[PDB]
Amino acid sequence: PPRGLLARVITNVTMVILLWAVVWSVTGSECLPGGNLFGIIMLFYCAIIGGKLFGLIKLPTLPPLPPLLGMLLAGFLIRNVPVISDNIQIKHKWSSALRSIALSVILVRAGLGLDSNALKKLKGVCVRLSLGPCLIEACTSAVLAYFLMGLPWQWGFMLGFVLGAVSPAVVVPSMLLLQEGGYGVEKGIPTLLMAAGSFDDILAITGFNTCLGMAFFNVLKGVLEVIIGVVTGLVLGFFIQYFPSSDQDNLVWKRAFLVLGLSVLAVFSSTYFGFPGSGGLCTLVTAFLAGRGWASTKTDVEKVIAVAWDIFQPLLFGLIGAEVLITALRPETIGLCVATLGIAVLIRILVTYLMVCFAGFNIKEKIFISFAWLPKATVQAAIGSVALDTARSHGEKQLEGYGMDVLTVAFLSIIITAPVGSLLIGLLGPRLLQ
Amino acid sequence: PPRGLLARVITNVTMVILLWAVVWSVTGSECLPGGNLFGIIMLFYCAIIGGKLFGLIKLPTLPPLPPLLGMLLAGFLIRNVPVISDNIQIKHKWSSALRSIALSVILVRAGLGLDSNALKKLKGVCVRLSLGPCLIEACTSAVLAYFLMGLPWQWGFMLGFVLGAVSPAVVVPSMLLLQEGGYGVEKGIPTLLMAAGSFDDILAITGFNTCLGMAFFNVLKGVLEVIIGVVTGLVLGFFIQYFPSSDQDNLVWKRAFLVLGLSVLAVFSSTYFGFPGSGGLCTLVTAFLAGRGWASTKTDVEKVIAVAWDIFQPLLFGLIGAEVLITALRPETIGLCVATLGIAVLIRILVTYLMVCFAGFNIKEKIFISFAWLPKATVQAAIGSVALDTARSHGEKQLEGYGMDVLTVAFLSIIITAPVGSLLIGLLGPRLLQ
């Protein structure tokens, strides 16, 4: 009599090797332990098992253990071991492309899940929260960094823009899960945070690019990117609410690919044209415009996108933590960098609390919004790599040394504020605004 | 208001180009019109539309037009036009690999649909039908060709083996439709023809290889191929009836994928090792062992394999008909080749009729069996291409001319007897054994 315990494993093993051989025939060395495709699958599995372990094995009693910490730790262990990192290697273009795709997935889901009429009721708070804390934190961090490390204003201002950048990837999943359940009456608070933390990305890169050029105009170029992004999103919006009608079938599957596929294509086309970052605004506008014109087909396509986002979630964080090979063990008095990021994070809490004292937020809503700007994600990692690449083209040792310090504080910030911030908002949601 | 008729096409077009752009990013090449992957998709679509046109627009009134004729014409047009020959091209390695995969699909489906206890009731007639008419037809064709074309016995014997060959790639779909429909009482007649005309490929290639070596031992090697195939099939048979059990879930998809993958792996492993054709019998034995196990999910997985076979059927015919550019317009007294082909077909009818006069087949069954061995398939094309490759390595003008003549008659035979034979058996099914 066959045994189910000894038959499930055998069947799965045979299926895996059979599928492995098929891809090996069409690719070759990629499926070999040393290759790109093999590394992506192994990194995907490593991130999956890391998330499961962090939350089901050693989870804390009262606060559930978020999988974000496990994903970053899994990527850190993979890259920071020469024998392990030898087999799994990923090209820079694939890492950048996967980052752009995953970032587009979380943005379109936020726009699709955003509630209408929220902008009309309160738009000033969203604009002030998008511009206010980002500029104040960058200035305060630059001043705090100045006269402490010795680097000039060109490096100080550049570090401030990189350090202050709210990341949609780490906040949107928290808001949508909270919004689906809901505590009390959600008066647009989840929509306010989701929309506000999107325009920040454009300003952060625009300031970073302009400041980088000074260390080597672009201010007007960034404005054109915002204008183009709105126009491109608006044009694509009318072609998703009109061509797909009730006459067509398979509405759930057909239109989910359409909105997601155009979102990915828009970002790559904008980046290839010469003005990156306009795609991030285009997908949000396209998703918001589509929701305006959907025939109550919101939750139908939300489930498909949610599954797609859940797939890319381990993949996105795995790439972020798998690029710390250079500074694996380089003790260079990192305590000073901790103080610089810690003060700026502390200032970030205070300024965000101040900006939400106008109306509506009486007592508890101020605290939740202030703590919702803690986590950081790929946005810092992408610009940080670009700064290193520009530095290591015609720069001498001093420029290389300064660039290394920027990487250390930027990587450390993602290690600290991302899992703690995501964990804090998860447990404080049912404990602050219920 | 949007119009569904004018929007469905637009939605489909946008989806296709968006999906096409995704492949462009993943694959650095093969996406342009000059790529081989683009040609595969075009050939697949051209064969699909060709089959639909031949049978739904200009179909004859009483006899339905089979799609086999349309597939051959569609492939012929693509290759036989100079401006449509260089823009779209397909490499030889992919064509050879796809032929083996398509051949494996029809073999496993034929074995799965085979009726149990059919071999035990009458196996002598199956062996005689497999060996008798095939060898006699090859000998008669060589003698008939001799004293007519002037080629020596080395070329005459090789032509006879290539000309005389029964392939299940065409007859099995006709038999399965007959089995599914049912007329009167089916005493294993469809299964008898499928089983007898399944392992004849091994004998055909063994004779071709033996004759090629003499024209440049193999008999002993061919016997070993049969022995290895039976042993591999027997061992693999117990691994599909035991490991996949009712305890697991999604048996329909899991078992169908498992048998398809193992069949492909066995054929590729045998071909790469140095003895091609052994995997052809191995999948038949493996399917027979799976059929004898009686998993009770035959019809559940037959539909899935039938859909897969229906997908690969235009692809297999498209590759065969896309290698006729060499002999597009070469008038070299082809009437003699037609006469030799007609006599060989006439000889095949007589010998097949003689071998089915033992028992059971009273009047109508003899006619059906004789007409069931007329259609031919890729078996001739594969060996014919090998003969051309061997000829064009150290051969002079006379050998080159002889090799071209062998291809012309072989290509002509496939063009004639395959669609006419398939059409003839299709209309005679409900009119002979009713």
Residue numbers in the entry:
A (entry chain A), B (entry chain B): 78 to 293, 300 to 517
Per the authors:
The Na+/H+ exchanger SLC9B2, also known as NHA2, correlates with the long-sought-after Na+/Li+ exchanger linked to the pathogenesis of diabetes mellitus and essential hypertension in humans. Here we report the cryo-EM structures of bison NHA2 in detergent and in nanodiscs, at 3.0 and 3.5 Å resolution, respectively. NHA2 consists of 14 transmembrane (TM) segments, rather than the 13 TMs previously observed in mammalian Na+/H+ exchangers (NHEs) and related bacterial antiporters. The additional N-terminal helix in NHA2 forms a unique homodimer interface with a large intracellular gap between the protomers, which closes in the presence of phosphoinositol lipids.
The bison NHA2 construct used for structural studies is referred to as NHA2ΔN, because it does not include the first 69 residues of the N-terminal tail. The bison NHA2ΔN sample preparation was subsequently optimized for grid preparation, cryo-EM data acquisition and structural determination at pH 8.0. The final cryo-EM map of NHA2ΔN in detergent was estimated at 3.0 Å (Fourier shell correlation (FSC) = 0.143 criterion), although protomer A was consistently better aligned than protomer B, and was therefore resolved at a higher resolution. Overall, the structure of NHA2ΔN in detergent has a model resolution at 4.2 Å (FSC = 0.5), which is reflected in the fact that some side chains in the core domain and the connecting TM6–TM7 loop could not be modeled, probably due to flexibility. The observed additional N-terminal helix TM –1 is part of the dimer domain in NHA2ΔN and is domain-swapped, mediating homodimerization by interacting with TM8 and the TM8–TM9 loop in the neighboring protomer. As a result of the tilted angle of TM –1 and the length of the connecting loop to TM1, the NHA2ΔN protomers are held apart by ~ 25 Å on the intracellular side. In NHA2ΔN, the dimerization contacts are small, made up solely from interactions between TM −1 in one protomer and TM8 in the other. Although NHA2ΔN homodimerization appears very different to any Na+/H+ exchanger observed so far, the NHA2ΔN monomer has a high degree of structural conservation with the outward-facing monomer of NapA, but with the additional TM −1 helix. Dynamic elastic modeling of the nanodisc NHA2ΔN structure shows that TM −1 is indeed flexible and can spontaneously adopt the position seen in the detergent structure.
